[PDB]
Motif scaffolding. Structure first.
Motif, PDB file in Angstrom:
ATOM      1  N   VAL A   1      34.321  36.420  46.871  1.00 10.48           N
ATOM      2  CA  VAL A   1      33.785  36.252  45.527  1.00 10.48           C
ATOM      3  C   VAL A   1      34.617  35.221  44.770  1.00 10.48           C
ATOM      4  CG1 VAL A   1      33.372  37.345  43.305  1.00 10.48           C
ATOM      5  CG2 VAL A   1      32.833  38.563  45.415  1.00 10.48           C
ATOM      6  N   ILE A   2      35.933  35.311  44.917  1.00  9.10           N
ATOM      7  CA  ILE A   2      36.836  34.377  44.256  1.00  9.10           C
ATOM      8  C   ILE A   2      36.632  32.982  44.840  1.00  9.10           C
ATOM      9  CG2 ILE A   2      39.246  33.731  43.920  1.00  9.10           C
ATOM     10  CD1 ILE A   2      39.925  36.734  44.009  1.00  9.10           C
ATOM     11  N   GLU A   3      36.428  32.927  46.152  1.00 10.02           N
ATOM     12  CA  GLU A   3      36.220  31.666  46.852  1.00 10.02           C
ATOM     13  C   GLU A   3      34.991  30.922  46.338  1.00 10.02           C
ATOM     14  OE1 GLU A   3      38.289  30.310  49.659  1.00 10.02           O
ATOM     15  OE2 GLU A   3      37.238  28.731  48.551  1.00 10.02           O
ATOM     16  N   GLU A   4      33.942  31.663  45.994  1.00  6.14           N
ATOM     17  CA  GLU A   4      32.720  31.040  45.502  1.00  6.14           C
ATOM     18  C   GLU A   4      32.721  30.760  44.004  1.00  6.14           C
ATOM     19  OE1 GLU A   4      30.191  34.341  46.961  1.00  6.14           O
ATOM     20  OE2 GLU A   4      29.463  34.481  44.893  1.00  6.14           O
TER      21      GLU A   4
ATOM     22  N   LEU B   1      30.971  43.089  41.668  1.00  4.85           N
ATOM     23  CA  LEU B   1      32.256  42.424  41.534  1.00  4.85           C
ATOM     24  C   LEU B   1      32.168  41.026  40.910  1.00  4.85           C
ATOM     25  CD1 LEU B   1      35.213  42.740  41.953  1.00  4.85           C
ATOM     26  CD2 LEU B   1      34.948  41.948  44.302  1.00  4.85           C
ATOM     27  N   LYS B   2      31.204  40.220  41.348  1.00  7.75           N
ATOM     28  CA  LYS B   2      31.060  38.868  40.812  1.00  7.75           C
ATOM     29  C   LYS B   2      30.775  38.875  39.313  1.00  7.75           C
ATOM     30  CE  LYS B   2      27.424  36.278  41.155  1.00  7.75           C
ATOM     31  NZ  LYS B   2      26.277  35.466  41.658  1.00  7.75           N
ATOM     32  N   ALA B   3      29.892  39.769  38.885  1.00  4.27           N
ATOM     33  CA  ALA B   3      29.529  39.877  37.477  1.00  4.27           C
ATOM     34  C   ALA B   3      30.718  40.254  36.598  1.00  4.27           C
ATOM     35  CB  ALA B   3      28.422  40.901  37.306  1.00  4.27           C
TER      36      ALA B   3
ATOM     37  N   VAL C   1      42.308  30.833  41.685  1.00  2.00           N
ATOM     38  CA  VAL C   1      42.118  30.241  40.371  1.00  2.00           C
ATOM     39  C   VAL C   1      40.634  30.035  40.112  1.00  2.00           C
ATOM     40  CG1 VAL C   1      42.626  28.279  38.876  1.00  2.00           C
ATOM     41  CG2 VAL C   1      44.325  29.039  40.546  1.00  2.00           C
ATOM     42  N   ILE C   2      40.174  30.518  38.965  1.00  2.00           N
ATOM     43  CA  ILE C   2      38.785  30.380  38.558  1.00  2.00           C
ATOM     44  C   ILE C   2      38.802  29.802  37.147  1.00  2.00           C
ATOM     45  CG2 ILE C   2      36.634  31.547  38.026  1.00  2.00           C
ATOM     46  CD1 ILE C   2      37.388  33.722  40.002  1.00  2.00           C
ATOM     47  N   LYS C   3      38.148  28.658  36.973  1.00  2.00           N
ATOM     48  CA  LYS C   3      38.105  27.990  35.679  1.00  2.00           C
ATOM     49  C   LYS C   3      39.508  27.872  35.095  1.00  2.00           C
ATOM     50  CE  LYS C   3      33.379  29.255  34.470  1.00  2.00           C
ATOM     51  NZ  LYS C   3      32.474  29.818  33.430  1.00  2.00           N
ATOM     52  N   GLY C   4      40.431  27.374  35.914  1.00  2.00           N
ATOM     53  CA  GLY C   4      41.807  27.186  35.488  1.00  2.00           C
ATOM     54  C   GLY C   4      42.631  28.434  35.235  1.00  2.00           C
ATOM     55  N   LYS C   5      42.043  29.609  35.423  1.00  2.00           N
ATOM     56  CA  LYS C   5      42.771  30.850  35.181  1.00  2.00           C
ATOM     57  C   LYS C   5      43.208  31.563  36.455  1.00  2.00           C
ATOM     58  CE  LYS C   5      40.259  31.303  30.881  1.00  2.00           C
ATOM     59  NZ  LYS C   5      39.398  32.152  30.030  1.00  2.00           N
TER      60      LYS C   5
END
Length: 391
Positions: free
Chosen positions: A258-261, A232-234, A282-286
């Motif tokens: 996964v999103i949290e990390e 999932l992380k990949a 939100v991950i890298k502003g997305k």
């Protein structure tokens, strides 16, 4: 930590996607969304044009015309389709002109062919004309500066033809917001592959990507992720790089972790049914969404949370389709829930579990929201139905 829908909605509203603007030729505008208002750059018609075949005249030269004493005008020229008149009318002068053609200088009226008598290269007029008779004045169809297309409007064949009609051959449209889609589950495999007992084919990935394509975005299917950290992380990392938004389906706390990390989890659980475990981060502003795996629940949560975001990115901020109808049967319900329904005319037919996950997906035309209170919906009583877009 469950939060009310309103809060989850406020959170998404806080997000802002800016896909950018691009110019495409008018012949490639069909289906695209106008990035800004478009006003007519010209008057339509762009010149005074005859509305009938006949004779262009200076109306004033016909004021004393009567059946007893007709006015005689000399025909000094003619104007046909597509020509720019290179002459003007003097007092007592007229010109033959065909429908649609441009009036020569000083002319302000056109007298139908049948309403005059032709004699020795001249014509007899028995009734006074008035300025404007037999004429479609410049800009009377569409005035220069008139609003033609609104920001956020989809360009259908009428819009593209309209823009063409005013000489526009390039239009500014929103670039398509990219949405990276992921399907999660150890039982899921992509279509085309042979199924082993215990496995099923993806349904939400294709559904999400195409619904996104239909509303104006670009759905990019990242593939299937196993229900474990590494897998999932990949995939989420790749999704974050290719899209402006990431949408994951596979629910019904690994994805949340996964999103949290990788970033931050704004919402983790919503006080609604279904979608209780729905995630928003939100991950890298997305923006990243984690939706339920059950087809109709994924569809419902997609519509409630992701659609508003995408529509706003396309200047369609507030383009949800709703329709009123009366239930075909009574409905019992506890928590704020959204009931998938099938529209069979003017009556909403509640969708049941046993019907199957896929059949339910196929039958769901929209959903009816039942207040956090509860009670029963009873028959009829009319209910508002938010439809799942269309086609």
């Amino acid at each position: 930590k469950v939060v009310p829908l309103e809060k989850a909605l406020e959170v998404v509203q806080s997000f802002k996607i800016s896909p950018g603007i691009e110019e495409v030729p008018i012949e490639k505008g069909l289906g695209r969304i106008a990035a800004e208002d478009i006003y007519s750059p010209i008057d339509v018609p762009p010149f005074d044009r005859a509305t009938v075949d006949g004779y262009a005249v200076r109306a004033e030269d016909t004021f004393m015309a009567s059946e007893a004493s007709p006015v005689r005008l000399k025909v000094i020229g003619s104007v046909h389709a597509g020509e720019e008149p290179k002459f003007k009318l003097g007092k007592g002068e007229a010109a033959y002109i065909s429908t649609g053609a441009m009036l020569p200088g000083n002319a302000d009226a056109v007298i139908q062919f049948e309403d005059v008598e032709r004699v020795n290269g001249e014509i007899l007029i028995y009734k006074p004309a008035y300025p404007g008779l037999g004429v479609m004045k410049k800009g009377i169809d569409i005035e220069k500066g008139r609003l033609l297309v609104k920001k956020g409007e989809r360009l259908g064949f009428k819009q593209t033809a309209l823009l063409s009609a005013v000489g526009i051959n390039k239009v500014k449209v929103f670039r398509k917001p990219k949405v990276a889609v992921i399907s999660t589950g150890n039982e899921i495999v992509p279509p085309g592959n042979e199924l082993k007992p215990g496995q099923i084919y993806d349904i939400n990935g294709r559904a999400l990507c195409d619904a996104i394509n239909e509303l104006g975005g670009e759905g990019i299917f990242m593939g299937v992720a196993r229900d474990d950290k590494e897998s999932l992380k990949a995939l989420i990392e790749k999704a974050v790089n290719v899209g402006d938004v990431v949408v994951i389906s596979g629910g019904a706390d690994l994805t949340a972790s996964v999103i949290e990390e990788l970033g931050e989890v704004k919402v983790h659980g919503i006080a609604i049914q279904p979608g209780k475990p729905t995630i928003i981060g939100v991950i890298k502003g997305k923006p990243v969404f984690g939706l339920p795996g059950y087809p109709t629940s994924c569809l419902t949560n997609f519509t409630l949370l992701v659609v508003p975001l995408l529509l706003r990115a396309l200047g369609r901020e507030g383009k949800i389709g709703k329709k009123v109808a009366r239930l075909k049967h009574k409905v019992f319900s506890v928590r704020r829930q959204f009931l998938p329904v099938k529209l069979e005319g003017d009556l909403a037919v509640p969708i049941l579990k046993g019907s199957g996950a896929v059949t339910s997906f196929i039958d769901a035309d929209g959903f009816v929201e039942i207040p956090e209170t509860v009670e029963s919906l009873d028959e009829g009583e009319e209910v508002e139905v938010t439809l799942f877009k269309g086609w």
